[PDB]
Amino acid sequence: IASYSIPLAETFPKNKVHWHVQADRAVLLIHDMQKYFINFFDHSQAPVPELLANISELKSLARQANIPVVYTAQPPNQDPIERALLTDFWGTGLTKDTEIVSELSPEDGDIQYTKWRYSAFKKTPLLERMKETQRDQLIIVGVYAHIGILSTALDAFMLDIQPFVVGDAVADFSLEDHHHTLKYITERVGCVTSLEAL
Template identity: 45%
Template sequence: MGLPAIGSYPMPDRTAIPRSHVSWRIDPARAALLVHDMQNHFVRAFPAGRAPVVELVDNIAALRELADTLDMPVVFSAEPAGQPPAQRGLVGDMWGPGIGDEPDAAAIVAPLTPRPGEHLLANVRHNAFLRSHLGRLLRSQNRDQLIICGVHAHLGVLLTAADAFMNDIQPFVVADAVADFSAEEHTLALRWAARTGVVCTTDGLLRALLLHRERRNA
């Protein structure tokens, strides 16, 4: 099985955001931004030039720009191309061989190309913490909050958020900066994410980060 055909669907707005069970507040001095699997292979499965992919890329770009401005670590996870079956393991049974050797299939989409000083981690499982040094990277920079965006909401985003929570890292899932196979799976992922962290919108998170900086500098 490979990626399913993905149809256009509208990004959720703030009225569709599930209530989180915690009242954590984002702090740019504690937070890092994770851009999960925003590779051509995955993004091209969405209808080009339509929702949700247009908002997905634009909102992640806005989060990334502010993160850079606030000196927050920016981390990209990316599935390696051409993984042998032994490395794919059970993921191969479920999703097939993964990214092949097609030109630029494994690259991060052009509007989000990693910059010098940003981090690019190989991601061999949906959970970006598993078999990577993401946890060590966050600890080394004294970061215990993780803003998560990218694809796919009910797989990598949700599993990464749950693992962050289990390791005492506060996850913030950005509802309109993630996307999924369908609106139904997107909504389901947000409901579950609200049980392990904060679900927010891009605009709300950007305002909260800027407000925290203003208060700190006052």
């Protein structure tokens, strides 16, 4: 909610692992970049405008590389039995603003999955399609870093998908959460990368 600056690549923690994204093995996951969740920042205020610039930039590189683009999004007016224990933590869920943000709207060839849990693997065909297409690297962007981003990355790593969390193309509740996720990713589950390194 309160304005902060996306960390600079030199401030990212060091990686344990020496992975490298290859476009035949890769998918770009654009995680929960719905207007409902970006509303909780001030759009005009950091980290939003840099966030929206680097994801648009990276998506653009994906179509060029024919790296698939998958959008995840939570559906409005969820069945309380289907939302289950998130309600205990987040209320009854979103009713409005379900679409992707304007400057990241999906164009024709992209894919949109309905997202039921922190992890984008739960109850989606993401894993099976990635197995089918022989893609085993997941490049992750969006919000929020220490919740959905972190959980998707943990799931990916455990299902043998190399997750690449893009440090400067995610945002979070706070610079502290933001820095905390990247430290956690770099130390236990994957690779923290940058738009320029990518």
